[PDB]
Structures are given as structure tokens and as C-alpha cells.
Amino acid sequence: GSSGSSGPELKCPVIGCDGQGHISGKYTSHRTASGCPLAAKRQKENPLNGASLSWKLNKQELPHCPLPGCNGLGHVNNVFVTHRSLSGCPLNAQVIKKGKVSSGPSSG
Ligand SMILES: [Zn+2]
Ligand SMILES: [Zn+2]
Numbered sequence: 001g002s003s004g005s006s007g008p009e010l011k012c013p014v015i016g017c018d019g020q021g022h023i024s025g026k027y028t029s030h031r032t033a034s035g036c037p038l039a040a041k042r043q044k045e046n047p048l049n050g051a052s053l054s055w056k057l058n059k060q061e062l063p064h065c066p067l068p069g070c071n072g073l074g075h076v077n078n079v080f081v082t083h084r085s086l087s088g089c090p091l092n093a094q095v096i097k098k099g100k101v102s103s104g105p106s107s108g
Pocket of ligand 2: 065066070083088092
């Protein structure tokens with residue numbers, strides 16, 4: 001090895017993606033959307049494949065919170081870490097406020 005080599009190259013423009021793998025399968029990597037397997041997995045619905053740690057799991061379920069940003073995790077009483085309702089939603093309680101002078105109707 002007299003010398004090495006370096007240089008930037010294309011990359012998966014699809015945010016959130018890892019860039020690894022290929023919508024074809026043969027290749028275990030990609031740097032474009034056309035070859036992005038993740039971008040295809042979304043548009044399509046093939047739950048065929050899927051591995052999840054299902055064994056000896058007592059607490060296995062998702063919360064029931066209306067708030068989009070809220071991950072149904074937490075509690076107003078500041079005691080637990082879960083909540084499947086508003087009254088319990090800690091992020092919904094603080095928000096509560098009658099008389100919010102500042103009001104921005106504009107929606108972009
Ligand atoms: Zn990708
Ligand atoms: Zn919540």
C-alpha cells in the first residue's frame with residue numbers, strides 16, 4: 001500500500017434512512033432515492049418481514065395520547081411515566097391557559 005484513497009460520494013437523500021441496504025436486495029447499500037429501500041417500504045405496504053422482541057414482555061403496548069408531538073409518556077401528577085389520556089398528559093396540562101394574549105392565526 002504505497003498510498004490510500006479518499007473522497008465524498010452520493011448519499012441517500014431520504015431523511016431518517018440509514019443509507020444501507022437496497023430496494024433490490026442484491027446490494028447491501030445505497031446512496032440514492034431510486035435505490036433507497038426505505039423510500040419504497042413506505043409507499044408500499046408489505047409487513048411480510050418484521051422481527052420484534054416478543055418474549056417475556058409484561059408491558060408491551062402503546063399509549064393513547066391525542067397530542068401528536070407527545071409520545072404518551074409522562075404524567076401531570078409527576079409520578080408515573082405513562083398516560084393514555086389528556087387529564088394525565090403532562091404536556092397538555094401546562095399548555096392549558098385562558099387568556100393567551102399572543103395569538104398567531106397565520107398558518108404559513
Ligand atoms: Zn435510503
Ligand atoms: Zn400526552
